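Quarterly update, task 2.4: flavin-adenine dinucleotide-bound model.
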Amino acid sequence: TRSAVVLGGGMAGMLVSSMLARHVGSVTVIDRDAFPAGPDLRKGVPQARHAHILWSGGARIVEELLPGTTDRLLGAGAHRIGIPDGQVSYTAYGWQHRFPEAQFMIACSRALLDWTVREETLREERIALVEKTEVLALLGDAGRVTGVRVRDQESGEEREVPADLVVDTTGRGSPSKRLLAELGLPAPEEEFVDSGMVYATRLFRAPEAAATNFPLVSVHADHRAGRPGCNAVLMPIEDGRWIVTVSGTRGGEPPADDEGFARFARDGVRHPLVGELIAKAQPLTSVERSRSTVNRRLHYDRLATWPEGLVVLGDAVAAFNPVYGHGMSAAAHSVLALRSQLGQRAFQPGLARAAQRAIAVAVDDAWVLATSHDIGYPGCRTQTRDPRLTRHAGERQRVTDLVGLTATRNQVVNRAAVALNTLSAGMASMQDPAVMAAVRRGPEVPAPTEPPLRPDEVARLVSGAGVT
Ligand SMILES: Cc1cc2nc3c(=O)[nH]c(=O)nc-3n(C[C@H](O)[C@H](O)[C@H](O)COP(=O)(O)OP(=O)(O)OC[C@H]3O[C@@H](n4cnc5c(N)ncnc54)[C@H](O)[C@@H]3O)c2cc1C
Ligand SMILES: [Cl-]
């Protein structure tokens, strides 16, 4: 009984459909893209050409909604990398000492993650993916949405797909601003923090011995330095490859040419480690860039009026600067927020509004973590009324910088910091008295003076082939 229509069959759409199919009789997913029968790139998810980190907070939720996905990913060559034990990270405050595991991440191509997640979701035959289909209009009116009018691309035929609940998960390029205007809703407040960040990515074949058990390697900008923020991330993915993504805010953008890529990874960032490691590896693709890096949020939950039966989640409601790596975990948290309101309110009037509000809460930590560190860069453009980002942003940042500094050399502060940064704990968790006590206790290990690489990791950057 009852039906859902989900707009967009990407990460948020697949997760939300798996959840919804446990609460409604059927789920229909509408997408204008064509979907490959394998782990390939597709036009509807262009961001898949860049490094994607799936933090524990999101990965645990993916596993809860689609049990077995983690093992299927690992069986397909994805890597489970412990945090901080499995990462070599030059932070704004120095090298992170590699304490024992506190959290983790899953490292693989976004194409593989999407394929795996889609396959697992569609094992439920009550979920149907309708490809190559345009979304023309929401059915109903500003008081209640009752489905969607769609158009088949190949035939051109239009039909109405009924729904008790429509969920827009069409991503950063969502047409809901248009769909909701034509439904007769007021325009939502648009909030953004635009550091002008640009990505550049090349794929590499790792040295053969380093195809597994290799760390996540990141060189971070110093958000406190009045200069463009540039980063470099090297991430293992399946089939013995490394995805390397470099990034820079306004005035420090990485170049488009293959030669400038390696120079940026050496000299454009604060430490050349990633540039050093890609010099061991074989490039496989030419530089691809992306400017889809603005933190942008639409406050649908604060509209004066909202239709029954409509919810927007994922990048369609809040999108982030990807350097912090939260988007997929924010969407997963947002799916559980909808599930929470479904369990509390079933389909009574008030469901959609309460879910939209809960989704606003769900994305708030990812939103603050990204925007708090982007607002300071030279030439950052902002449109916000959030006092946390302006008036007393410095005080919020003074505490974050003290936590961030102490986390590099104190295990208890690190454990709390990585719980928050993986979206495994809430923002307030850091004000726990015991955390602030550890912060005041300060460092328990010396600051590393060199990249904290293990001998047995560096040993695997060479084959030893030309040696009798
Ligand atoms: C460069 C870059 C790097 C990133 N790195 C990370 C990372 O490390 N970690 C992380 O967690 N997140 C990362 N993200 C964010 C992540 O990609 C998104 O948060 C995530 O894909 C959001 O999922 P979604 O389902 O909301 O949208 P998407 O996954 O983009 O899916 C949107 C879907 O809607 C469909 N669609 C779009 N428009 C229409 C339309 N008009 N009609 C019908 N269908 C439509 C598309 O075909 C697609 O299937 C990164 C993003 C970028 C750009
Ligand atoms: Cl992109």
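Highlight for this quarter: The longest strand covers residues 133-141.
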